[PDB]
From TrEMBL, chain E:
Keywords: Coiled coil, Disulfide bond, Host cell membrane, Host cytoplasm, Host cytoplasmic vesicle, Host membrane, Host synapse, Hydrolase, Membrane, Metal-binding, Metalloprotease, Neurotoxin, Protease, Secreted, Toxin, Transmembrane, Transmembrane helix, Virulence, Zinc. This is Bontoxilysin-A. The chain holds residues 1 to 420 of 1296 of the full protein. Residues 5-408 form the Botulinum/Tetanus toxin catalytic chain domain. GO terms for biological process: proteolysis. The keyword Membrane applies. One of its GO terms (cellular component) is host cell cytoplasmic vesicle. It comes from Clostridium botulinum. Belongs to the peptidase M27 family. GO terms for molecular function: metalloendopeptidase activity; protein transmembrane transporter activity; toxin activity; zinc ion binding. It is found in: Host cytoplasm, Host cytosol; Host cytoplasmic vesicle, Host secretory vesicle, Host synaptic vesicle membrane; Host synapse, Host presynaptic cell membrane; Secreted. Zn(2+) binds at H224, H228, E260.
Length: 126, 115, 122, 122, 418, 126
């Protein structure tokens, strides 16, 4: 379980009225390294796990279907601290949001599993 | 994300019985071999049982033959380590792991059992 | 399973859109233990692989079968099947049951039925 | 097209001397992992068996046939990948084709030279 | 003088069930049978993208763009047509011949052919039994299928086209690549691409300088993977949790395994400590003793019409065991030392560069610069004896054949990694 | 290219005589094939005589030790059986058969011998 030493502690979920905003946050502990990419996935009731927004240190950002323009992802430099500013929330954004961390690798380097947070609940009333 | 959630452990009397269970998610379970390890505080980890992908066949470390039984439910993505005739040495943190390709071994959290 | 016999039937004259079911009675070996292939040949042309079925029962489709032809097998009756649907003039030809997977040429050691004629015309 | 041997044993030297004379034999191994071979010299007369004269390992440990003891010395150059046989006090009986052998120390395969003539006569 | 691939294969040649046949790999039950080619005893080539060995890599969908690392290349259409599969097959066979044409490569390939995975699959100690993940099912023209042992499969790469690697199926209680047993090795590899590197060491070991002026000879790349397979077939691979951090940037946290350092060779391989080196050899000397013991105590064999004594002799041939007048096997320390040193110190990327006489990265701790499309199958482009540096042309000197600017007709840059 | 095994060198000799049999291999290399010699007298079973493995590991049937010598020329891809002190009992058709890498046992061999030649006749008579 040597990889289980890295932990993704996530904060900033909660209740909000439709049209409001939330800011999710995630700080990693136990890492002697800087993640190449960090981001956010979600799982809505009765549906599988989908990408919300993920960004790598070269500035590339990938989004789920309705995220770009509404959800802004940011990161504290190369520190393993990442934020999700969720604007204009809607009721079907309700679900559990997980942190994600991906280490860099090259063709000849050691590979590592990705890191995942335990999840935090976001629930937006209509 | 691959997850292996183990449970069924605790404090047991010499001669008692235990059933360890592991909940597997996030990978194609029926294509993975399932292992049970253990590790006392002052000793290196030790493999205790392993079962073929299909449940075809299992093998056991000598110290547990006839006392321990490993099994898998490929319909429910569950693995078990049913234990019996517990001994004061069998006390350790027990780990379940899954692997299909050598060197690509996914681990569980662990469950402490004391005799 | 040395001496092998394959006898197809089910061919016929059909109009475009129509349906046919081919069968092949196998004898001398256990059909369910082999890879088998449905193959067709239009006059003056090479063989076209239609579909195969595995010992496990999994069927695989060539281009002509995809979304239209269902390959299946009755183990106890030692019989293979090709349910055809939405047939079109370009499906015309002789249809063979042949041993092997993705069979489309006569290969030493492979066995073939005698074929059954499929004609699609309006 | 055609493929040649992965390793080439290029023998040189030898010749024709009178009894009591000396001759040197040499062999360059081209393209071999010289380290994983014993290097030996053999000799053969027509109709007879190819016989060991002397061999030497990568660490330069030598082995001589009884005929070679006290007059022949075998040496080995692990940088140049050569093996040499210095013959002295030669006798008519030493007349033969001499061959170098690269003998794989794990038994994988061997390489043999073409053969170099040594003639001793008055 | 015999070729390693004693037959001319075309992708569209009809199956025969012996060296051309549709095959299924074990525990990939839902996979479609794939056409395969037995280019040499114990060695099969499958010109397909590898959607089979790993069930979590069952398609060629790339990750989200943010999740792709700089050194990666995705093209889901690569290796989808019969013409590409034909060219892939002939590219792989040509590389095998190039390797086999050196004494180093002949030796390595001999080790690979005789490195049969051990028959250690029974729960009964005294019963020899194959391990089924060291076999494939070979479909016959009569529709029957036959289980066949094999040491080596060359397969096309998965979604990442340039992720070349040597993998093998694991076992419930045996770590086959590190207990001396060995296991069938699957090498994701493509002869249709190669990597740009830089002749200047300063640039080659800098992650952003240069764009990859020189092209790696794909024979070296294949040989690299074949060296891993050699370690793994003899069950002497170094545990992948033995790694050392790249201390030159650093906060990336990049690491390379000892297994990789050993495989590359040269100055790299001296970072492994001499104390550890002797210990690994002792460990595996003991594992070879254990295998000889298991063979001496073997009383029966199952799942084959081959005799028990023959199967015992197969493994005497693999591990170079001694046999006494009672028929008992033992490990000869001189032959084991030579076998071990050969597998680990002789068979190295750096030594293949010396035998091929090509230009190559001088260290494993370099940085890839680009991927190029290539086509080594035409003899006017690349040969068994010369690679790109055709000795009968102006490409003979200064590694001009690997110079992607001088020999620019032989390279199409597909992606810069910098 | 094409697979072939050709025995030759047989004939009629007298008791005490000598014959050298050849086994020429085509389509495969002795670098990876063992070669065993067999013989079948009219009306009796086949019996193993001798085998020489790909690494030149050598075995003999008891009734032939000290009389026959098996040897090999990998350059010629040929295996030889030099037979001295021939006895009437040695009469029969002699065959060579390949086996991958290793020799089978002198008696009780299995399907490891997967290919063999048409044989060569050896007659030992006064
Ligand atoms: Zn490597």
């Amino acid at each position: 379980p040597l990889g289980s030493q890295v932990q993704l502690v996530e904060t900033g979920g909660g209740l909000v009225q439709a049209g409001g905003s939330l800011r999710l946050s995630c700080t990693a502990s136990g890492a002697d390294f800087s993640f190449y990419a960090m981001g956010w996935y979600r799982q809505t009731p009765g549906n599988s796990r989908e990408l919300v927004a993920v960004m790598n240190l070269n500035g590339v950002i990938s989004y789920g279907d309705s995220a770009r323009g509404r959800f802004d992802i940011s990161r504290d430099g190369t520190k393993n601290i990442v934020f999700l500013q969720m604007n204009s929330l809607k009721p079907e954004d309700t679900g559990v949001y997980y942190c994600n961390g991906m280490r860099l690798y090259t063709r000849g380097s050691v590979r590592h599993p990705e890191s995942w947070g335990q999840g935090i609940q976001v629930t937006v009333s209509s | 994300q691959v997850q292996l959630a183990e449970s069924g452990g605790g404090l047991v009397q010499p001669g008692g019985s235990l059933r360890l269970s592991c909940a597997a998610s996030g990978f194609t379970f029926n294509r993975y071999v399932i292992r049970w390890y253990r590790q006392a505080p002052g000793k290196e980890r030790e493999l205790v049982a392993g079962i073929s992908r299909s449940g075809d066949s299992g093998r056991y470390v000598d110290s547990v033959k006839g006392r321990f039984t490993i099994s898998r439910d490929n319909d429910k993505n569950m693995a078990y380590l049913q234990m019996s005739s517990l001994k004061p040495d069998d006390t350790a943190v027990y780990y379940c792991s899954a692997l299909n390709l050598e060197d690509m071994e996914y681990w569980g959290q662990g469950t402490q059992v004391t005799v | 399973g040395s001496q092998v016999q394959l006898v197809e039937s089910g061919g016929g004259l059909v109009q475009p859109g129509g349906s046919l079911r081919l069968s092949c009675a196998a004898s001398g070996f256990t059909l369910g233990s082999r890879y088998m292939s449905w193959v067709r040949q239009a006059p003056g042309e090479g063989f076209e692989w239609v579909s195969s079925i595995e010992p496990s029962g999994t069927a695989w489709d060539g281009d002509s079968a995809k979304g239209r032809f269902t390959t299946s097998r009755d183990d106890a009756k030692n019989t293979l099947y090709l349910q055809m649907s939405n047939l079109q003039p370009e499906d015309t030809g002789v249809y063979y049951c042949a041993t092997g997977y993705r069979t489309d040429t006569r290969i030493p050691g492979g066995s073939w039925g005698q074929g059954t004629q499929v004609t699609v015309s309006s | 097209g055609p493929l040649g041997s992965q390793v080439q044993l290029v023998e040189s030297g030898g010749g024709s001397v009178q009894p009591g004379g000396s001759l040197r034999l040499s062999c360059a191994a081209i393209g071999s992992v010289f380290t994983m071979y014993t290097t030996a010299w053999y000799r053969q007369t027509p109709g007879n068996l190819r016989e060991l004269v002397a061999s030497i390992t990568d660490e330069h440990r030598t082995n001589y046939a009884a005929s070679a003891e006290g007059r022949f010395t075998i040496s080995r150059d692990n940088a140049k990948h050569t093996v040499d046989l210095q013959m002295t006090n030669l006798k008519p009986e030493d007349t033969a084709v001499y061959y170098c052998k690269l003998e794989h120390d794990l038994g994988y395969y061997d390489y043999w030279g073409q053969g170099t003539q040594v003639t001793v006569s008055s | 003088s015999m070729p390693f691939v004693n037959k001319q294969f075309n992708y569209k040649d009809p199956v025969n069930g012996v060296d051309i046949a549709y095959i299924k790999i074990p525990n990939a039950g839902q996979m479609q049978p794939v056409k395969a080619f037995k280019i040499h005893n114990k060695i099969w080539v499958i010109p397909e993208r590898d959607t089979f060995t790993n069930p979590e890599e069952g398609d060629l969908n790339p990750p989200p763009e943010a999740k792709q690392v700089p050194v990666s290349y995705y093209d889901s259409t690569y290796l989808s047509t019969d013409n590409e599969k034909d060219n892939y097959l002939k590219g792989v066979t040509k590389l095998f011949e190039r390797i086999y044409s050196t004494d180093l490569g002949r030796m390595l390939l001999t080790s690979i052919v005789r490195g049969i995975p051990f028959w250690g699959g029974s729960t009964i100690d005294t019963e020899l039994k194959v391990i089924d993940t060291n076999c494939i099912n070979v479909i016959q023209p009569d529709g029957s299928y036959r289980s066949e042992e094999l040491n080596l499969v060359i397969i096309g790469p998965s979604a990442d086209i340039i992720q070349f690697e040597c993998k093998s199926f694991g076992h419930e209680v045996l770590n086959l690549t590190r207990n001396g047993y060995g296991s069938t090795q699957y090498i994701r590899f493509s002869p249709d691409f190669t990597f740009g590197f830089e002749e200047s060491l300063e640039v080659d070991t800098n992650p952003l300088l240069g764009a990859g002026k020189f092209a790696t000879d794909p024979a070296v790349t294949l040989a690299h993977e074949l060296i891993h397979a050699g370690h793994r077939l003899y069950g002497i691979a170094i545990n992948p949790n033995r790694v050392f951090k790249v201390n030159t940037y650093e906060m990336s946290g990049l690491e390379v395994s000892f297994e990789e350092l050993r495989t590359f060779g040269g100055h790299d391989a001296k970072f492994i400590d001499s104390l550890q080196e002797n210990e690994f050899r002792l460990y595996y000397y003991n594992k070879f003793k254990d295998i000889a013991s298991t063979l001496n105590k073997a009383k029966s064999i199952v799942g084959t019409t081959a005799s028990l004594q023959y199967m015992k002799n197969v493994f005497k041939e693999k591990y170079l065991l001694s046999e006494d007048t009672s028929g008992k096997f033992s490990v000869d320390k001189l032959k084991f030392d030579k076998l071990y040193k050969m597998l680990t110190e002789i068979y190295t990327e750096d030594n293949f560069v010396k035998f091929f006489k090509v230009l190559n990265r001088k260290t494993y701790l370099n940085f890839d610069k680009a991927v190029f499309k290539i086509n080594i199958v035409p003899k006017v482009n690349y040969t068994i004896y010369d690679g790109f540096n055709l000795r009968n042309t102006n490409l003979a000197a200064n590694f001009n054949g690997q110079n992607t600017e001088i020999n620019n007709m032989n390279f199409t840059k597909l992606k810069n990694f910098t | 290219s094409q697979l072939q095994l050709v025995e030759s060198g047989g004939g009629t000799v007298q008791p005490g005589g000598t014959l050298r049999l050849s086994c020429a291999a085509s389509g495969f290399t002795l670098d990876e094939y063992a070669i065993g010699w067999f013989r079948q007298a009219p009306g009796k079973e086949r019996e193993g005589v001798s085998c020489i493995s790909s690494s030149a590991s050598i075995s003999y049937a008891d009734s032939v030790k000290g009389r026959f010598t098996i040897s090999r020329d990998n350059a010629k891809n040929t295996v030889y059986l030099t037979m001295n002190s021939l006895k009437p009992e040695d009469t029969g058709v002699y065959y060579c058969a390949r086996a991958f890498l290793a020799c089978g046992p002198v008696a009780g061999w299995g399907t490891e011998y997967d290919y063999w030649g048409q044989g060569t006749q050896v007659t030992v008579s006064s």
